Structures are given as structure tokens and as C-alpha cells.
Amino acid sequence: QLRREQVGTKASDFLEWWVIELQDCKADCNLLPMVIFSD
Amino acid sequence: LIRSVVGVVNQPIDVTVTLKLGGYEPLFTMSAQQPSIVPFTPQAYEELSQQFDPYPLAMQFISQYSPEDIVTAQIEGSSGALWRISPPSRAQMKQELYNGTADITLRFTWNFQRDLAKGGTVEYTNEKHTLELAPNSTARRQLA
Amino acid sequence: LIRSVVGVVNQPIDVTVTLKLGGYEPLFTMSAQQPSIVPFTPQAYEELSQQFDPYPLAMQFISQYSPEDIVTAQIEGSSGALWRISPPSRAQMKQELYNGTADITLRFTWNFQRDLAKGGTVEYTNEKHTLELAPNSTARRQLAQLLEGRPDQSVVIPHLFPKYIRAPNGPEANPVKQLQPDEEEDYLGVRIQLRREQVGTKASDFLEWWVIELQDCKADCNLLPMVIFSD
Numbered sequence: 001q002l003r004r005e006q007v008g009t010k011a012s013d014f015l016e017w018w019v020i021e022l023q024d025c026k027a028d029c030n031l032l033p034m035v036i037f038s039d
Numbered sequence: 040l041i042r043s044v045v046g047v048v049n050q051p052i053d054v055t056v057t058l059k060l061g062g063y064e065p066l067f068t069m070s071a072q073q074p075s076i077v078p079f080t081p082q083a084y085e086e087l088s089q090q091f092d093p094y095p096l097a098m099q100f101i102s103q104y105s106p107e108d109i110v111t112a113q114i115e116g117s118s119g120a121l122w123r124i125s126p127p128s129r130a131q132m133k134q135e136l137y138n139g140t141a142d143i144t145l146r147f148t149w150n151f152q153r154d155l156a157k158g159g160t161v162e163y164t165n166e167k168h169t170l171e172l173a174p175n176s177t178a179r180r181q182l183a
Numbered sequence: 184l185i186r187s188v189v190g191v192v193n194q195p196i197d198v199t200v201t202l203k204l205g206g207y208e209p210l211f212t213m214s215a216q217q218p219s220i221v222p223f224t225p226q227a228y229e230e231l232s233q234q235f236d237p238y239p240l241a242m243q244f245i246s247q248y249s250p251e252d253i254v255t256a257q258i259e260g261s262s263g264a265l266w267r268i269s270p271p272s273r274a275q276m277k278q279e280l281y282n283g284t285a286d287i288t289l290r291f292t293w294n295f296q297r298d299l300a301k302g303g304t305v306e307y308t309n310e311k312h313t314l315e316l317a318p319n320s321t322a323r324r325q326l327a328q329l330l331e332g333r334p335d336q337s338v339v340i341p342h343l344f345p346k347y348i349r350a351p352n353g354p355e356a357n358p359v360k361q362l363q364p365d366e367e368e369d370y371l372g373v374r375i376q377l378r379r380e381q382v383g384t385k386a387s388d389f390l391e392w393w394v395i396e397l398q399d400c401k402a403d404c405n406l407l408p409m410v411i412f413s414d
Contacts, residue, residue: 119268120269
């Protein structure tokens with residue numbers, strides 16, 4: 001997700017960030033998993 | 040008996056991961072700590088034994104480690120910040136993605152940092168991963 | 184005579200400290216350098232010998248080191264930045280603090296980095312410190328009055344901040360149990376400012392940061408002190 005938010009001049013009045021997710025998010029558009037293997 | 044003693048586990052307390060599209064700014068970034076790290080329960084160790092049955096390399100991979108040698112990082116889907124960036128630089132990356140007739144890279148960079156009192160004489164283990172997008176490609180058009 | 188030679192002091196050039204309330208964003212952060220570090224004068228070494236007289240562990244702690252093995256970090260009370268944060272994430276932490284019926288942690292994380300040409304085979308010495316707040320507690324209610332978007336309030340801090348930190352010859356910094364013998368209550372008190380500034384949509388038109396201070400600031404709402412003990 002691009003996320004602009006109205007508060008480029010107009011594109012600065014919009015304020016944006018990025019949201020990551022899965023191809024089909026269930027709740028991982030909030031919290032994606034990944035598993036790692038320490039040593 | 041000096042090469043035998045081993046088993047002090049190094050559960051990494053630190054995960055930092057950023058998606059950096061272009062050299063202008065890392066677009067997505069986040070880090071997380073042990074609230075967003077799951078130490079495995081041995082039930083979930085048996086689960087990770089289960090779901091990947093007929094693959095032998097995966098079988099020895101699961102049976103290699105201890106139960107508590109593997110952890111599960113969670114990463115926040117939303118940003119922990121803004122895309123704090125100069126709008127001239129957004130304009131230049133925008134106009135390159137319009138008509139800059141060359142390639143563009145994406146670095147997905149996972150990154151980890153362990154603890155230090157556990158031992159380990161190197162701390163910041165990671166690697167990048169590169170995806171390459173053509174001048175005016177399909178995913179480039181989605182970004183457009 | 185190979186285990187005898189010692190005395191090359193490692194005065195740490197780097198202090199980085201952040202207050203991270205919640206997993207959403209570290210609210211307060213700062214670092215400082217040698218303008219905001221005070222190398223002791225031996226007059227102040229005798230002073231630190233003086234003010235903590237009848238405590239024997241503190242007495243051996245002061246008499247252990249050299250005069251120039253201890254330094255005093257200053258930390259800016261105001262922010263060095265903004266609370267740069269997504270207003271959805273501010274809304275989710277706000278609504279958790281409203282009605283998310285679980286606990287919430289605060290990490291005060293002091294952190295240090297020494298120099299490298301002085302020696303020392305480990306560099307980033309630190310430790311966190313956790314304060315736990317209940318679902319809808321009293322300090323949580325002070326934060327609830329903070330997060331409403333109103334330009335008046337303040338906070339009460341149940342003693343997170345230590346003042347004297349042993350900077351070891353190892354990987355993990357730890358406070359002094361000798362000059363401060365009480366391990367949760369000897370550690371001093373903080374107070375905070377939310378600072379919004381008109382330029383949530385209106386809450387984005389207001390622009391906010393955090394300002395740290397003492398329970399009763401005299402000038403340390405600009406510059407709080409803390410004293411650390413290199414090795």
C-alpha cells in the first residue's frame with residue numbers, strides 16, 4: 001500500500017507511507033511472519 | 040574435551056528489515072524485538088516437523104537443531120514511520136520511472152543482530168536480495 | 184609482566200539513548216558527543232568522593248577507578264527530531280491505550296559506544312530497562328490525557344531513569360548498585376512533554392514531539408545529567 005493522507009505541493013499536503021502485506025492477507029497485513037534458524 | 044562443549048544457544052534478539060526501492064530512499068523499514076519474536080514451543084517444533092513431510096533435506100534441517108534454536112520473527116505490515124523524502128527526489132525517481140530508459144533495482148534487506156553475552160564474535164548477520172525491473176515494465180507500470 | 188600492563192583508559196565518545204514506549208515507534212530519542220560529555224576534573228572527582236559518604240560500597244566504587252575513568256553524559260531534554268509516525272499507528276496505539284485490555288511496556292534504553300583505537304574488542308555496551316503499565320492504569324491515564332491532542336498536560340514517572348552507570352570492559356552496560364543501592368527506586372524520576380504545533384487530520388496539522396525532564400527541572404529540562412563509569 002501507498003498511503004497518502006491530506007493534511008508536489010498538494011502531494012506534500014498529502015502525507016504518505018508504505019504498508020507491506022501478503023498476496024492474500026488474512027491478518028498479516030498487520031503482522032507478516034517469517035521463521036529464522038539460529039546457531 | 041575442549042572441542043566438545045557446545046550448546047549455549049544464541050537466540051537473536053534483533054531483527055531489522057527494510058525494503059529499499061531505488062537509491063533515493065528506503066521506502067519501507069521496520070525493526071522488531073522479542074514481543075514480535077516468537078520463541079518456539081516444542082509443540083510448534085513438532086508442527087514444523089509435520090507440515091513438510093516428504094522433503095528429505097527439510098527433514099534433516101528440522102531434525103538438525105534443538106527445538107529452541109529456531110525463532111519466528113513477526114514484522115509489522117504498516118510503516119513505523121513516514122516516507123520522509125524530498126519531493127524533488129520523488130519527482131526525479133517518478134520521472135525516471137516514467138522515461139529514464141534504464142533498469143531499477145529493489146533491495147529487500149533482512150538483517151539480524153544477536154546478543155553479545157551469549158558469545159559469538161560477529162554480530163550483524165544479513166544479506167540483501169535484488170529484484171530488477173526493466174525500463175517501463177509491468178510491475179514498473181503498477182508503481183507508475 | 185604481560186598481565187601487568189594496564190591503564191590505557193577508554194573514555195566512551197558515544198552515548199545514544201532512546202525512550203521507546205510501545206512497539207509502534209521510539210517516542211524519544213537522542214544521541215550526544217563530547218561537547219555533551221564532561222570529562223571530570225579531579226575537583227569533581229573529590230566532589231563525587233564527598234557527597235556519598237557513609238555508604239561503603241559507594242566508597243570503594245569511587246576509590247576503585249582513576250579520576251579520569253568516569254565521565255558525565257548530558258542529554259538534551261528536548262527532542263532532536265519529531266515524533267515521525269503514521270497517524271493510523273498513532274490511532275491504534277491510542278485505541279489500545281483506550282481499550283486494549285492488556286499490558287504495555289516501556290523500554291528506556293541507554294546505549295554507549297566507545298572508541299576503537301583505544302582498544303576493546305566489543306563496542307556497543309548497553310542494557311534496556313522495562314516498565315510495565317496495566318490496561319487502563321494511572322500513568323496510562325496520564326498518557327491518555329496526553330494523547331487526546333491537548334496542549335497542557337504532563338506525566339508522572341515511576342522511576343525508570345538511573346543516573347550512575349558502570350560502563351564495563353564487556354558487552355553490556357549496567358548501573359551502579361553502590362552509589363545507588365536500591366535497584367529500582369534509587370533510579371531517579373522523569374517528566375515529559377508532548378508538544379503539538381499547528382501548521383488525525385487536524386492532529387497531523389498539529390506537529391508533535393517529546394521533551395524529557397526531571398520531576399522538578401531547574402535547567403535540566405534542557406539538559407539532564409547522568410554519570411557513567413568507564414573501564
